[PDB]
Amino acid sequence: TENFNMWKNNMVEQMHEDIISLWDQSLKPCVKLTGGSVITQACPKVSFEPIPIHYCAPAGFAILKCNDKKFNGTGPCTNVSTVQCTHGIRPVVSTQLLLNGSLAEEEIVIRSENFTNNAKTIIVQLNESVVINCTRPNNGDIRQAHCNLSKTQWENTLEQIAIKLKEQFGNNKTIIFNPSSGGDPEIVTHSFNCGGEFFYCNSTQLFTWNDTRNITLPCRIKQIINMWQEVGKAMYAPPIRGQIRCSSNITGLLLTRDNGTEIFRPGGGDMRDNWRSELYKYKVVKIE
Amino acid sequence: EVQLVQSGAEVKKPGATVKISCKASGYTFSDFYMYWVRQAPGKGLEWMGLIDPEDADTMYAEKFRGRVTITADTSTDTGYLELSSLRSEDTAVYYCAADPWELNAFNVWGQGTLVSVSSASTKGPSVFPLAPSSKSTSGGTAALGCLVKDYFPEPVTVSWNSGALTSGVHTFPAVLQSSGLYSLSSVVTVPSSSLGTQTYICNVNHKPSNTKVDKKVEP
Amino acid sequence: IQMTQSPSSVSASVGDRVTITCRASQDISTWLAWYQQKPGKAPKLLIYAASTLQSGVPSRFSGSGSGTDFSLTINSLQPEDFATYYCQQANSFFTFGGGTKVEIKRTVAAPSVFIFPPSDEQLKSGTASVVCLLNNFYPREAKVQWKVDNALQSGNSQESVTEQDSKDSTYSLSSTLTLSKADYEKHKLYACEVTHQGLSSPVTKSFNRGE
Ligand SMILES: CC1(C)CC(NC(=O)C(=O)Nc2ccc(Br)cc2)CC(C)(C)N1
Ligand SMILES: *[C@@H]1O[C@H](CO)[C@@H](O)[C@H](O)[C@H]1NC(C)=O
Ligand SMILES: *[C@@H]1O[C@H](CO)[C@@H](O)[C@H](O)[C@H]1NC(C)=O
Ligand SMILES: *[C@@H]1O[C@H](CO)[C@@H](O)[C@H](O)[C@H]1NC(C)=O
Ligand SMILES: *[C@@H]1O[C@H](CO)[C@@H](O)[C@H](O)[C@H]1NC(C)=O
Ligand SMILES: *[C@@H]1O[C@H](CO)[C@@H](O)[C@H](O)[C@H]1NC(C)=O
Ligand SMILES: *[C@@H]1O[C@H](CO)[C@@H](O)[C@H](O)[C@H]1NC(C)=O
Ligand SMILES: *[C@@H]1O[C@H](CO)[C@@H](O)[C@H](O)[C@H]1NC(C)=O
């Protein structure tokens, strides 16, 4: 019966430094602009194929696991378990949508470090994934792409989420979803890496819902991107001509709230929150 | 179908700012990169920078990195280039390139835009005769020509007898004087036994100042 | 981000095999493009990807290399292959090389030296320009000096060389000496000695002001 905390968690920062070192080995930029410095280097074309990473505890330490069906990530856990390593976590760098993550045991669970604070990001965990296929036409335009998913299935998701929102912010309220107000291309659109290429999918049909068959998302591939590891820009090599396909499960979302009504917009940017959605039941403790 | 039309040549003062435009056609303008390259007379090609219009992502060469700016108006499908703090060294033909077929190379090129930077104002040239003599005759051949001096900016065309005479006609490239004015010479080798019978007239043309001059060369 | 192209100049005959190289300071894989430029005309793409040929470009053009070292070669040299070629980075930035000019190789030819005194029309304006002409010679390398009263002067003259001719494949140089009316009147002997590979001894063409 110990106290858990996902926001001040140390494991999150542990794998964040791990993923950064991973991108420097496989996906190396050709040009890097940071702190008024122009850096150029080799830019090999290596395909990014995610593999489940199991984070274990070092010598003289242990990993505690909380088994609560509805644990908000902050407070004393009554069902604590001692494990050797965490579950296979698929390091998927993205925004707005959480891909290939872990689902909820019972029902949807919205988590936040401070619901009252509109600046704090809200992490949503679905209890049922929605498949989304993002492919890139074979050898028109090489930087053009698109994604497909079930319209009706995505409708239910929004509905179920809106129910949890009002269940926390009071019943007598109207929940409305609106696209990102602004910001970098990576934040305004659903961005992610697939086949070594950076996708920027337009997410206006997913986040334009009101209380009162499928969806095709137009996407594009860029070479100039705003680094997520740190502050600065980077330019990668030209896209490959081969077919690029990636079918992934939507297991969660990142929302951000700001005309007296409840308006929620797609969040993202800090990949730390992405790791939190998987390490909200774990914590490293030194053996006595 | 696919062509890049740039704006007319210009003339600037050392310290002013110039802005060139490039209209594209025959392809999705907002879905492809636009490149810029300049070439100084006598030198080679020099890359300046590129741009991704839809998001306005730019990359500038280390040399112009500080006083250059590339933009792209997707409303009129036209790219712009801006270079400030112009000097006499910035004089060259600027090109805007593209790659519709995505080959990672400049497949299409504009007609170019000559940007002349100098403290000298626009001025027509002065044509001077190069009279033949015993100091310019070799056996049966004779040497004569015309001298176009003190003009700005480029270019200048020169013909002899209205294009009637082409054989043995040599027109040299212009030279930039310390005064900021250009000057060139054109010569022709002809039979010495025809100097006292055949008439020789050079035709100089300067469009930038609307100056046409027809000079007759005599011994 | 730096491209070195050598040699800087090459001379060959028609029907020969020409080969130019290109070095990159950093590994850019196979992202190198080759261009062909002619005096007055805009550059035309020849080879992209450092191997793939452009649609329409003769098959006699071939390229190779990968990483940092590349090369361009031509099976046979045609009369329209004589020009300047450039190699270009194309992985992220697009830095060009120094370029290489392909000139026609022929036998040595002695320059025809001629001199032209200032015209009366120019003297009335307030200036005086002396022109020394070197007609039809080879190679392109040549020296031209101005001596006023046996005094070697510098800083008050400029020159220009025409492109390689197509009929005889030679060059022509023009050197102009410009002085004010006053300065030009303070001397008498004006000469321009020329030194060329086709000339055993320095040839000198001169004239006395008022001849
Ligand atoms: C904290 C804050 C606001 C977050 C910003 N995030 C990003 O730029 C980002 O996530 N970019 C990105 C890049 C590739 C892919 Br694929 C997906 C996303 C970057 C920094 C500098 C850390 N500032
Ligand atoms: C999480 O649970 C703890 C302990 O019951 C509680 O103090 C806290 O308010 C909860 N946090 C949220 C955001 O519901
Ligand atoms: C997922 O959550 C919904 C309510 O949002 C709930 O009805 C359902 O039982 C949960 N999982 C299943 C079994 O579909
Ligand atoms: C969350 O934000 C509210 C409103 O600013 C504030 O009153 C509260 O103290 C915050 N809760 C925290 C930081 O735990
Ligand atoms: C791709 O997505 C579609 C729905 O858009 C789904 O039916 C299909 O199973 C996915 N991949 C496969 C196996 O075709
Ligand atoms: C996303 O799509 C909508 C609908 O076509 C469009 O209005 C909007 O401009 C797009 N957003 C971006 C950033 O391209
Ligand atoms: C998500 O996981 C699936 C299954 O391993 C994989 O095929 C897909 O590429 C992943 N999606 C992304 C964006 O990495
Ligand atoms: C989505 O993919 C994951 C593996 O990445 C798989 O385990 C899961 O069953 C999929 N989601 C569903 C239920 O369609």
mmCIF file of N, CA, C and O and ligand atoms in Angstrom, chain A residues 104-108 126-128 156-157 159-161 163-164, ligand 3:
data_model
loop_
_atom_site.group_PDB
_atom_site.id
_atom_site.type_symbol
_atom_site.label_atom_id
_atom_site.label_comp_id
_atom_site.label_asym_id
_atom_site.label_seq_id
_atom_site.Cartn_x
_atom_site.Cartn_y
_atom_site.Cartn_z
ATOM 1 N N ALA A 104 -7.429 0.218 -21.846
ATOM 2 C CA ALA A 104 -7.933 0.198 -20.478
ATOM 3 C C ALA A 104 -8.589 -1.144 -20.173
ATOM 4 O O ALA A 104 -9.186 -1.766 -21.051
ATOM 5 N N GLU A 105 -8.476 -1.583 -18.925
ATOM 6 C CA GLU A 105 -9.020 -2.872 -18.511
ATOM 7 C C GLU A 105 -10.544 -2.915 -18.615
ATOM 8 O O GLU A 105 -11.102 -3.772 -19.300
ATOM 9 N N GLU A 106 -11.213 -1.989 -17.935
ATOM 10 C CA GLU A 106 -12.671 -1.939 -17.954
ATOM 11 C C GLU A 106 -13.199 -0.911 -18.950
ATOM 12 O O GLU A 106 -13.609 -1.260 -20.057
ATOM 13 N N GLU A 107 -13.186 0.356 -18.550
ATOM 14 C CA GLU A 107 -13.722 1.425 -19.384
ATOM 15 C C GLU A 107 -12.716 2.556 -19.578
ATOM 16 O O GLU A 107 -11.624 2.533 -19.010
ATOM 17 N N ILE A 108 -13.095 3.544 -20.385
ATOM 18 C CA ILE A 108 -12.233 4.688 -20.660
ATOM 19 C C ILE A 108 -11.845 5.416 -19.378
ATOM 20 O O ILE A 108 -12.653 5.548 -18.459
ATOM 21 N N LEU A 126 -8.370 4.657 -24.111
ATOM 22 C CA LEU A 126 -9.537 3.931 -24.597
ATOM 23 C C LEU A 126 -9.528 2.486 -24.114
ATOM 24 O O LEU A 126 -8.467 1.912 -23.865
ATOM 25 N N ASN A 127 -10.714 1.903 -23.982
ATOM 26 C CA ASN A 127 -10.835 0.495 -23.625
ATOM 27 C C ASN A 127 -11.101 -0.354 -24.862
ATOM 28 O O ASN A 127 -11.443 -1.532 -24.765
ATOM 29 N N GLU A 128 -10.940 0.264 -26.029
ATOM 30 C CA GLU A 128 -11.097 -0.428 -27.302
ATOM 31 C C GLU A 128 -10.447 0.380 -28.420
ATOM 32 O O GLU A 128 -10.804 1.536 -28.654
ATOM 33 N N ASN A 156 -18.484 6.822 -31.976
ATOM 34 C CA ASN A 156 -18.693 6.252 -30.651
ATOM 35 C C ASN A 156 -17.596 6.662 -29.675
ATOM 36 O O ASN A 156 -17.872 7.016 -28.529
ATOM 37 N N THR A 157 -16.351 6.614 -30.140
ATOM 38 C CA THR A 157 -15.211 6.979 -29.309
ATOM 39 C C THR A 157 -15.382 8.384 -28.742
ATOM 40 O O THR A 157 -15.279 8.592 -27.533
ATOM 41 N N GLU A 159 -18.097 10.108 -28.492
ATOM 42 C CA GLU A 159 -19.268 10.118 -27.623
ATOM 43 C C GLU A 159 -18.927 9.588 -26.234
ATOM 44 O O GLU A 159 -19.260 10.208 -25.224
ATOM 45 N N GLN A 160 -18.262 8.438 -26.190
ATOM 46 C CA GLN A 160 -17.889 7.820 -24.924
ATOM 47 C C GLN A 160 -16.937 8.705 -24.127
ATOM 48 O O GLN A 160 -17.031 8.785 -22.901
ATOM 49 N N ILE A 161 -16.023 9.369 -24.826
ATOM 50 C CA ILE A 161 -15.065 10.259 -24.178
ATOM 51 C C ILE A 161 -15.762 11.485 -23.599
ATOM 52 O O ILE A 161 -15.483 11.895 -22.473
ATOM 53 N N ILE A 163 -18.648 11.687 -22.534
ATOM 54 C CA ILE A 163 -19.394 11.265 -21.354
ATOM 55 C C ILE A 163 -18.506 11.286 -20.115
ATOM 56 O O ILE A 163 -18.933 11.708 -19.040
ATOM 57 N N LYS A 164 -17.269 10.829 -20.273
ATOM 58 C CA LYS A 164 -16.309 10.828 -19.176
ATOM 59 C C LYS A 164 -15.895 12.248 -18.809
ATOM 60 O O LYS A 164 -15.637 12.548 -17.644
HETATM 61 C C1 LIG D 3 -15.559 0.402 -23.133
HETATM 62 O O1 LIG D 3 -16.238 1.525 -22.613
HETATM 63 C C2 LIG D 3 -17.618 1.519 -22.908
HETATM 64 C C3 LIG D 3 -18.245 2.822 -22.428
HETATM 65 O O2 LIG D 3 -17.522 3.912 -22.955
HETATM 66 C C4 LIG D 3 -18.290 0.322 -22.249
HETATM 67 O O3 LIG D 3 -19.653 0.295 -22.609
HETATM 68 C C5 LIG D 3 -17.623 -0.976 -22.681
HETATM 69 O O4 LIG D 3 -18.112 -2.036 -21.891
HETATM 70 C C6 LIG D 3 -16.110 -0.887 -22.531
HETATM 71 N N1 LIG D 3 -15.481 -2.027 -23.167
HETATM 72 C C7 LIG D 3 -16.185 -2.884 -23.901
HETATM 73 C C8 LIG D 3 -16.422 -4.239 -23.303
HETATM 74 O O5 LIG D 3 -16.629 -2.602 -25.013
#
